[PDB]
């Protein structure tokens, strides 16, 4: 066809190298359809920004969220009601993580502390010590009883969970770390700092497997994909997807003119959320990169204009329900809108741009 | 203090804090060069362009230094690697200027033959056009034009080029063939290009400009319909309907006059009264 | 025309230096496979010209900035100040506020 | 072929510059084919 006409005359040494081939393939490639989202309920009840949210990884009945009034709250998922409250930090709670192997709530905060809550009695069991400034990140290891935390300290600490010893410290970056993800096979810790790198760590050796330098600014949000063994890293308008165990660039997402991207999330069936600092929440296909819905969060009654921005988000365990917490100190739930079909709500029609040379 | 080893260690310690900072890289390259240590600066410029490949000033620094020493094979190899990474048009225009200054006329065609694939627009094809008119034969320029126009007609399933861009290409083809006294080929070119793309009105205006410069009623009808769309977008429309009814055929003018009567606050009411009066008079010349 | 980017100022500086190099012109490789090192055989001249070119250009730019300092230090017609650094700060405020509105 | 519808006219160290940077570290791998077995 047309690529035969190009290839026989211009004669590239590699057919994959030439840009008309890599642009003709994307037009013939035809992504998958996904359903459009909507707002379902809105939950008030904090006294400051909703900085972080986590979901029950077992029963899917409650979701906890920490905040900027230094308290965490456990809300009922199905009805939206407030079950209980937890205090024990003096500055704000940056990230929460509930374990799936033991009944433990590891909370992290800006007052330089890392704590372990029992959920069988709702009290603090274990405090952890060693961060020079305020930690902003908790992941929990899938099979090894570890905590990985990080902050403005520019290192990653891999705490033993029994003896609470800072066993392994990963010293690589050149700035505060925004995200740390744990991974069960040898790229075991995947982190992302504010010096525009994303690193894949060998925790046994102590050095880096591979540094990913493709982003231009600070990487503020990452996400692991539940069924793929791949990671997604967001930037100030640059969402990319990376393979682990090699470090490939699998796909670039058409994510231009969306502002500072605070959070990411990935559904089971290849949806990628990316909430932004400009109050715009945009939904992507994962395997393709096509942005098929954009929405705007109407903030509140007497709020400001700057006060609408999604600071945190997660998906439900079944995956059909999005939980965001915005900067207007409120919690908003989003829903898949079951009625629409492929003909009723198509999307944004998949017109990749040869200009911006990113596709 | 004329101690160069301590200055090197200080510049390296300075790079370990902040590698994003370009004036530090430039001072350390210059501080090697001014003391006449060219191989240290070659190692340093290598480490600079391989550390930060998307920075333009570092590659151009290494190209200045290899020009100033008169190493033309190194400058050709440097632009070859520098063009290999899909840079952008400043790097390509620099390399075509280098291979003009070296008077390697055979190589500039190879550079443009890769440069029309690294950047497809008509401005790059037209740059290779102008080079082939300046330093090539009639036959080379003709083959370059043909290789332009057949790829443009082929690759519309991708939609790279807009309408004005295709019209600019076809106008260049035609006026150059008219300069080469092939009037038949030019008129046939406009026939085939109007046939291939029906709606590119810029190409049709290029045809009419060529045929007026070197038929008439169709031109009046097309220009009147374009001016009528322009005056409907501006609003005026009554004179448009009058010029359409003078041009028309007339059933479309009558239905457009009924649409304009639908389209019809002092000058507003005056234009409405005039349009309704003229439409009713044109209906009375041709009860209910 | 306004502010110019870095990818454009880089090319204009490259082209000015090549223009200088053409008017200045008007007036091999050995790979040792034992180590892997490349020795390029460059002439002693055109290295001296490169070094003297960089030295003379830096001295020219240095003296131009030095003369600009005195001619900007004479003119007191900006605003009232109390030392040598307040004068520069107030001239910065004049330059921003005249251009803004 | 657009051209055939027209009438005829009647009258050494290259691989040593930057070995670390390559083009294929820029191209995403799932660009060409989607549905790739990662």
Curated annotation (Swiss-Prot), chain A:
The keyword RNA-binding does not apply. GO terms for cellular component: catalytic step 2 spliceosome; cytoplasm; Prp19 complex; spliceosomal complex. The keyword Magnesium does not apply. It is found in: Cytoplasm; Nucleus. WD repeats lie at residues 45-76, 88-118, 130-160, 172-202, 214-243, 256-285, 305-335. It comes from the Eukaryota. Keywords: Cytoplasm, mRNA processing, mRNA splicing, Nucleus, Repeat, Spliceosome, WD repeat. One of its GO terms (biological process) is mRNA splicing, via spliceosome. Disulfide bonds: none annotated. Involved in pre-mRNA splicing. May also be required for cell cycle progression at G2/M. Belongs to the CWC complex (or CEF1-associated complex), a spliceosome subcomplex composed of the U2, U5 and U6 snRNAs and at least BUD13, BUD31, BRR2, CDC40, CEF1, CLF1, CUS1, CWC2, CWC15, CWC21, CWC22, CWC23, CWC24, CWC25, CWC27, ECM2, HSH155, IST3, ISY1, LEA1, MSL1, NTC20, PRP8, PRP9, PRP11, PRP19, PRP21, PRP22, PRP45, PRP46, SLU7, SMB1, SMD1, SMD2, SMD3, SMX2, SMX3, SNT309, SNU114, SPP2, SYF1, SYF2, RSE1 and YJU2. Interacts with CEF1, CLF1, NTC20, PRP45 and SYF1. Belongs to the WD repeat PRL1/PRL2 family. Present with 1770 molecules/cell in log phase SD medium. This is Pre-mRNA-splicing factor PRP46. It comes from Saccharomyces cerevisiae (strain ATCC 204508 / S288c) (Baker's yeast).
UniProtKB/Swiss-Prot annotation, chain B:
It is found in: Nucleus. HAT repeats lie at residues 2-34, 36-68, 70-101, 103-134, 136-170, 174-206, 220-248, 252-278. It comes from the Eukaryota. Belongs to the crooked-neck family. Involved in pre-mRNA splicing and cell cycle progression. Required for the spliceosome assembly by promoting the functional integration of the U4/U6.U5 tri-snRNP particle into the U1-, U2-dependent pre-spliceosome. Also recruits PRP19 to the spliceosome, as a component of the NTC complex (or PRP19-associated complex). The association of the NTC complex to the spliceosome mediates conformational rearrangement or stabilizes the structure of the spliceosome after U4 snRNA dissociation, which leads to spliceosome maturation. Present with 2140 molecules/cell in log phase SD medium. Belongs to the NTC complex (or PRP19-associated complex), composed of at least CEF1, CLF1, ISY1, NTC20, SNT309, SYF1, SYF2, and PRP19. This is Pre-mRNA-splicing factor CLF1. The lineage of its organism: Eukaryota, Fungi, Dikarya, Ascomycota, Saccharomycotina.
Swiss-Prot record, chain C:
Disulfide bonds: none annotated. Coiled coil: none annotated. It is found in: Nucleus. Residues 20-27 have a biased composition (Polar residues). Belongs to the NTC complex (or PRP19-associated complex), composed of at least CEF1, CLF1, ISY1, NTC20, SNT309, SYF1, SYF2, and PRP19. Involved in pre-mRNA splicing and cell cycle control. As a component of the NTC complex (or PRP19-associated complex), associates to the spliceosome to mediate conformational rearrangement or to stabilize the structure of the spliceosome after U4 snRNA dissociation, which leads to spliceosome maturation. The cell cycle arrest of SYF2 defective cells may be due to the inefficient splicing of TUB1. Belongs to the SYF2 family. Present with 1670 molecules/cell in log phase SD medium. This is Pre-mRNA-splicing factor SYF2. It comes from Saccharomyces cerevisiae (strain ATCC 204508 / S288c) (Baker's yeast). The chain holds residues 92 to 215 of 215 of the full protein.
UniProtKB/Swiss-Prot annotation, chain D:
Transmembrane segments: none annotated. Coiled coil: none annotated. It is found in: Nucleus. It comes from the Eukaryota. Residues 1-10 have a biased composition (Pro residues). Disulfide bonds: none annotated. Signal peptide: none annotated. Present with 1670 molecules/cell in log phase SD medium. Involved in pre-mRNA splicing. Associated with the spliceosome throughout the splicing reactions, until after the second catalytic step. Belongs to the SNW family. Belongs to the CWC complex (or CEF1-associated complex), a spliceosome sub-complex reminiscent of a late-stage spliceosome composed of the U2, U5 and U6 snRNAs and at least BUD13, BUD31, BRR2, CDC40, CEF1, CLF1, CUS1, CWC2, CWC15, CWC21, CWC22, CWC23, CWC24, CWC25, CWC27, ECM2, HSH155, IST3, ISY1, LEA1, MSL1, NTC20, PRP8, PRP9, PRP11, PRP19, PRP21, PRP22, PRP45, PRP46, SLU7, SMB1, SMD1, SMD2, SMD3, SMX2, SMX3, SNT309, SNU114, SPP2, SYF1, SYF2, RSE1 and YJU2. Interacts with CLF1, PRP22 and PRP46. Interacts with SPP382. This is Pre-mRNA-processing protein 45. It comes from Saccharomyces cerevisiae (strain ATCC 204508 / S288c) (Baker's yeast). The chain holds residues 1 to 55 of 379 of the full protein.
């Amino acid at each position: 066809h047309a690529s035969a006409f190009v290839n026989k005359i211009f004669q590239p040494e590699v057919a994959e190298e030439l840009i008309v081939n890599r642009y003709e393939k994307l037009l013939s490639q035809r992504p998958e359809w996904h359903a459009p989202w909507k707002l379902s309920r809105v939950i008030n009840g904090h006294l400051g920004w909703v900085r972080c949210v986590a979901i029950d990884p077992v029963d899917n009945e409650w979701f906890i969220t920490g905040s900027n009034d230094t308290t965490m709250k456990v809300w009922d998922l199905a009805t939206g009601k407030l079950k209980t409250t937890l205090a024990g930090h003096v500055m704000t709670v940056r990230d929460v993580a509930v374990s799936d192997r033991h009944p433990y709530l590891f909370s992290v905060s800006e007052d330089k502390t890392v704590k372990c809550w029992d959920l069988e009695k709702n009290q603090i069991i274990r405090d952890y010590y060693g961060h020079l400034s305020g930690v902003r990140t908790v992941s929990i290891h899938p099979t090894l009883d570890l905590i990985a935390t990080a902050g403005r300290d520019s290192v990653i600490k891999l705490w033993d969970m029994r003896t609470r010893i800072p066993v392994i410290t990963l010293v690589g970056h050149k700035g505060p770390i925004n995200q740390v993800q744990c991974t069960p096979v040898d790229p075991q810790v995947v982190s992302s700092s504010t010096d525009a790198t994303v690193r894949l760590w060998d925790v046994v050796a102590g050095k880096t497997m591979k540094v990913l330098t493709h982003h231009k600014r600070s990487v503020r949000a990452t996400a692991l994909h539940p069924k793929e063994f791949s990671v997604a890293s967001a930037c100030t308008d640059d969402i990319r997807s990376w393979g682990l165990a090699e470090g490939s660039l699998l796909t670039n997402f058409e994510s231009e003119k969306t502002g500072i991207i605070n959070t990411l999330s990935i559904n089971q069936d290849d949806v990628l959320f990316a909430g932004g600092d400009n109050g715009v929440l945009s939904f992507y296909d994962y395997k393709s990169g096509h942005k098929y819905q954009s929405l705007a969060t109407r903030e509140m009654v007497g709020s400001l204009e700057g006060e609408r921005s999604v600071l945190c988000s997660t998906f439900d365990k079944t995956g059909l329900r999005l939980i965001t917490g915005e900067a207007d100190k409120s919690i908003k739930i989003w829903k898949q809108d079951e009625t629409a079909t492929k003909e009723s709500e198509p999307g944004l029609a998949w017109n990749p741009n040869l200009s911006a040379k990113r596709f | 203090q004329h101690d160069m080893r301590r200055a090197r260690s200080i510049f390296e310690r300075a790079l370990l804090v902040d590698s994003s900072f370009i004036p530090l890289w430039i001072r350390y390259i210059d501080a090697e060069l001014k003391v006449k240590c060219i191989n240290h600066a070659r190692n340093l410029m290598n480490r600079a362009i391989s550390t930060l490949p998307r920075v333009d000033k570092l590659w151009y620094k290494y190209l200045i230094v290899e020009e100033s020493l008169n190493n033309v094979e190194i400058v050709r190899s440097l632009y070859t690697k520098w063009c290999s990474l899909e840079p952008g048009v400043n790097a390509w225009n620099s390399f075509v200027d280098f291979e003009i200054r070296q008077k390697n006329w055979n190589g500039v065609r190879e550079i443009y033959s890769k440069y029309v694939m690294a950047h497809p627009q008509m401005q790059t094809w037209l740059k290779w056009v102008r080079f082939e008119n300046r330093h090539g034969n009639t036959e080379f320029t003709r083959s370059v034009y043909s290789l332009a126009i057949d790829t443009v007609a082929n690759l519309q399933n991708l939609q790279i080029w807009s309408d004005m861009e295709v019209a600019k290409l076809v106008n260049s083809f035609a006026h150059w063939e008219a300069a080469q006294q092939e009037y038949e080929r030019s008129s046939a070119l406009y026939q085939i290009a109007i046939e291939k793309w029906p709606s590119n009105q810029l190409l049709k205006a290029g045809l009419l400009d060529f045929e007026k410069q070197f038929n008439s009623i169709e031109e009046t009808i097309s220009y009147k319909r374009k001016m009528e769309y322009e005056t409907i977008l501006s609003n005026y429309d009554t004179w448009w309907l009058y010029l359409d009814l003078i041009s028309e055929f007339p059933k479309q003018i009558m239905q457009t006059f009924e649409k304009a009567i639908v389209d019809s606050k002092n000058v507003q009411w005056k234009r409405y009264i005039y349009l309704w009066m003229r439409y009713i008079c044109y209906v009375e010349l041709e009860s209910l | 025309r306004g502010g110019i980017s870095y990818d454009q100022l880089a090319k204009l500086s490259y082209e000015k230096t090549l223009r200088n190099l053409a008017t200045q012109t008007q007036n091999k490789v050995q790979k040792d496979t034992k180590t892997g090192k490349i020795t390029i055989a460059d002439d002693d001249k055109l290295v001296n010209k490169l070094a003297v070119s960089l030295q003379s250009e830096s001295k020219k730019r240095y003296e131009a900035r030095k003369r600009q300092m005195q001619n900007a230090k004479t003119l007191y017609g900006v605003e009232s100040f109390i030392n040598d650094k307040n004068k520069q700060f107030n001239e910065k405020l004049s330059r921003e506020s005249k251009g803004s509105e | 072929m657009f051209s055939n519808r027209l009438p005829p006219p009647k009258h050494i160290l290259t691989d040593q510059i930057a070995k670390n940077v390559k083009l294929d570290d820029f191209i995403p791998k799932r660009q060409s084919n989607f549905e790739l077995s990662v």
